[PDB]
Amino acid sequence: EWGQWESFKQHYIENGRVVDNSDPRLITTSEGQSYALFFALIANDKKTFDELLGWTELHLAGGDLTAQLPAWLWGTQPDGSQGILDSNSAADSDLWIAYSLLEAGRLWDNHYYQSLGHLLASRILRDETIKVSGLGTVLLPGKVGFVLGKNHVRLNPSYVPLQLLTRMNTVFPSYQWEEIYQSSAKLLKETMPKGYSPDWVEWDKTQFKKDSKAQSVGSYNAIRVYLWAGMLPDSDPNKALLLGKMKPLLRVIERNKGMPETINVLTGKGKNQGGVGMNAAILPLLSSLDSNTNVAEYEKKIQAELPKIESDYYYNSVLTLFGLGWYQDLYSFNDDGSVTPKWVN
């Protein structure tokens, strides 16, 4: 029913795990699992959803997702065995997994999925959030390694889709999730002086500062900011504020026909060509604002490039699933952060 999803399963999923073969360790990430769970839900694919969930729990979460956040990285170890390569969590993926479970629970009337999504979400609060001066409670990028000093944290704009955060608060209200929505909105709006979001940025007590490691680069992480924002319902007051800053991006598309591999968020100047994944990632945004780009023809170009990412290009494939899937009306987000797949109505 969703051709691109059927292709993705064939070429990227092996017995419940999403494989990124660009790493010679033939890795699976909690990110890959999280996106595949979401896509399986959008596709009304209960069987694959179950397979993905089971693999995630067994291999990344010690057989119990109610007991711990999943490890983010799994694959071939130096001795040839397969196992966890990094036991740290990745909060963006934790959030996508919790969201997909909550939404699958609602859409499929599956009380287990509802409960599991809830218990995972509660653990995200426990294990990878912290309250800092001025910004309040933030979602940290992982359970360890992102607290850099007193009231000083390293954050990642792409990790916090406002629609997912809205959803955390709408059936079981939570002062913590409300605070995280607010700090995330502030993070997004205040670190894009030219309408471009960095991959990483620090909050140091009283202000945002250039990330000491990643500097001012916006690249593969950050391209998702435009993706999530372009798919917000206009009920979210932050959508208009974020999109109001993105005229430079639209001009980049007019002139260069796509976003660059890396962009300097302070100057708006970019390096290299970004690729079909990044082009799909900006498609919802492109469809939502005025520019000289013919959107229909832009989408046709993306479609023409799909055979080239049939295999061996995990990340471009998930970006195209998100962006083309949305453009082709396969799913939309609602005012309460929930998602309505095409198959519902």
DSSP annotation string for 253-311: HHHHSS-EEEEETTT--EEEE--HHHHHHTHHHHTTS--SS-HHHHHHHHHHHGGGGSS
Phi/psi of residue 210, each to 5°?
-50, 135
Query: 3-class SS at 288?
Result: coil
* Catalytic member of 31, 103, 199, 202: 31
Quick one: 110 or 340, whose CB is closer to Cl ion? Answer: 340
**Shorter beta-carbon distance to Cl ion: residue 296 or 344:** 344
Q: Is 64 a catalytic residue?
A: no
Bridge-partner residues for 54, per DSSP?
none
Q: State the binding string over 316-345 for Cl ion (x if CB under 5 A, else -).
A: ------------------------x---x-
Least CB distance from residue 344 to Cl ion, whole Å?
5
Q: How far is the CB of 338 from Cl ion (least distance, A)?
A: 6
Distances (CA, A) of 305 to 219, 259, 275, 276, 309: 20, 16, 9, 7, 7
In the complex with Cl ion, the residue whose CB is nearer, 209 or 342, is 342
| CA neighbours closer than 13 Å in the CB half-sphere of residue 44 | 11
Whole-angstrom Cα distance, residue 206 to residue 133?
7
Binding residues for Cl ion, how many (CB under 5 A)? Answer: 2
- Active-site residue (options: 45, 57, 92, 199): 92
Q: Cα torsion for 191, 195, 200, 201, to the nearest 10°?
A: -10
Widest CA span in the chain:
54
Closer residue to Cl ion, CB minimum distance, 135 or 339: 339
Give the shortest CB-290-to-Cl ion separation in angstroms: 30
Q: Which is nearer to Cl ion, 161 or 198 (CB)?
A: 161
* 125 exposure class (CB count in 10 Å sphere: 0-12, 13-18, 19+): middle
CB of 334 to Cl ion, least distance (A): 7
Distance of closest approach, residue 345 Cβ to Cl ion, in angstroms: 8
Distance (Å, whole) CA 168 – CA 96 = 11
Strand partners, 180: none
Q: Say how far apart CA 56 and CA 142 lie, in whole Å.
A: 17
What mask of x and - would describe binding to Cl ion in positions 94 to 133, judged by CB under 5 A?
A: ----------------------------------------
Q: Residue 129: beta bridge partners?
A: 139
Residue among 68 and 340 whose Cβ is closer to Cl ion: 340
Could you say whether residue 44 binds Cl ion (CB under 5 A)?
Answer: no
Residue 260 β-bridge partners: 273
Q: Which residue has the tokens 């990110």?
A: 31
51 is catalytic: no
Instruction: State the nearest-atom distance from the C-beta of 340 to Cl ion, in Å.
Output: 4
Looking at the annotation, which residues are catalytic? 31, 92
Which residues contact Cl ion by CB under 5 A?
340, 344
